[PDB]
Amino acid sequence: SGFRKMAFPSGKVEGCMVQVTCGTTTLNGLWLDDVVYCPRHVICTSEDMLNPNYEDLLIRKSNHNFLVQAGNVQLRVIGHSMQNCVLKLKVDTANPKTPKYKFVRIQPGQTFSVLACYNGSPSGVYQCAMRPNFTIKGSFLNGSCGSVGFNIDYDCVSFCYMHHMELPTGVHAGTDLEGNFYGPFVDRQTAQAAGTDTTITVNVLAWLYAAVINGDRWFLNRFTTTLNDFNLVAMKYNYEPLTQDHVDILGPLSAQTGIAVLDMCASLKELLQNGMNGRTILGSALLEDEFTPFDVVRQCSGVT
Amino acid sequence: SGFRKMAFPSGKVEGCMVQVTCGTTTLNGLWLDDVVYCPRHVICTSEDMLNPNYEDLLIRKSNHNFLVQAGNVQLRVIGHSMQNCVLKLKVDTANPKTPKYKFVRIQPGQTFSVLACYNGSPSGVYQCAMRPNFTIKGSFLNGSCGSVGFNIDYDCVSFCYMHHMELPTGVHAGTDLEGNFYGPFVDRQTAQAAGTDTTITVNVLAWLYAAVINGDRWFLNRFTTTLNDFNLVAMKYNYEPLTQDHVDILGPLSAQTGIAVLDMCASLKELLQNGMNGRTILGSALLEDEFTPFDVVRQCSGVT
Ligand SMILES: *CC(=O)N1CCN(Cc2cccc3ccccc23)CC1
């Protein structure tokens, strides 16, 4: 019992983290097989950041200008290319610690583990969600970019995130491992506002299921509601619209607690309309939306 | 910027996790050098758990009755001893992945990373604190015991916790790596209530410092207070008494924010007396007490 914001074990990803230096800029790279992936803004001076022409900047750069360090051993760079907003540095050595991996582009509402790194050294690990506005609420200092987000399915690491940006509102933007930004964000020092940060309704409901399973049931009520009726209250409170897909995805949690999804929707409505009245649910004073139904099943069943 | 409940990278500890089976009971063990540490209740049938005589139970057991599996390879057990509430199984092979390590007994209020395991396989990692009542608020299912808590100082892993118990109130009790329980808890199926779960005042203040550093400053006020005056309000709200040691430990955070510790105490008093009024601090609706001053410094400075 007990329910905690849990990251995947970071071991497999620690073995992939290197330091990448281009001139006076050091950040993190991901070393898989004989390629090192890093943010392309590694080639920039902070002056370049106001309006960088990455193609023109990159012409001035040679293989030997990319200093790649794995632990305290230097890797030899034999090739370099730009793919969207990432550089791929070809090294002459395959990472012997390369795990089975995939690059996946995640959907908003989906959760991943971040291994925060500085100078290719891991400092810690936390669980994130891709926000509906394609931002993440990270912990990222200068030197932290090239830090990655991942899921692990048993022995396969699916890389979903590379860290690139902090927005002047202190939230975080980045790319998938093919270098395409989540959201409308660009690797340039320009006015960029995050959109409305809406709540991942299906994740709140999952976390209400997790609460019930873990004995916190005070918020359960005598009421039910409808998708249309529930969604009127969601709208008012900047919650994502709930769909039959979401309801289907909650089915297993429904089945195990024997609480219909729409009854839990009615509980959630009362929580939105009435607040918590100073009470807590799994030790939280607000509604947690960064556990997926899949996350809840995993943590409440002990999947390794 | 941004501030997250961060665990240490779990890599070094993943390489130490094995499965331990005694008859029909499988839990996790920690493999360091040529010793495997596990909870001694591995030798129990759930019938034994009502009033186990561990010495008498252990006489019936031989080296060959302790099945130790590291990944999918069996370790040969050449010795077995009980130290307090842990077994030490001597194996003929030193763990080649043994990191530099220490066993430390932590103080209440101190924080550690947990690597939750099932059948010697890591499922995830989360950050805990030792509560003033010597419980932790974990996520632990059946098979999770022998899962460990740790800190990492650069390359040295200090093991502080091994998981043993869930209390009927769904909080968690366990031992240091010398097998001594934190708190008055015993590895027996008996009436055992956790004491008052008081708030780690120095950790709340640290987390208020972390908030200020990360731009969340609404709760800052025009007031100050005194240790004695602040502690009257702490008492009323089941907060730990604040001492000059605590104030000294906050000094660096004081220095960096230029907010005197006693001014922040006055902010905390107003938060206790007045509540949050529906506002949030670092995305939390209650006062977080599971970051230490040391944790805040680390995360707001990027220590690897
Ligand atoms: C990524 C990291 O660790 N830091 C933040 C980004 N910075 C370079 C950079 C990249 C994109 C946009 C942007 C805007 C303003 C300033 C800097 C920027 C490197 C360090």
Ligand SMILES: *CC(=O)N1CCN(Cc2cccc3ccccc23)CC1
């Ligand atoms: C540790 C774990 O994964 N589980 C919980 C503990 N249980 C055996 C055990 C140990 C101490 C007390 C106690 C009390 C009641 C029932 C079982 C108990 C093994 C599984």
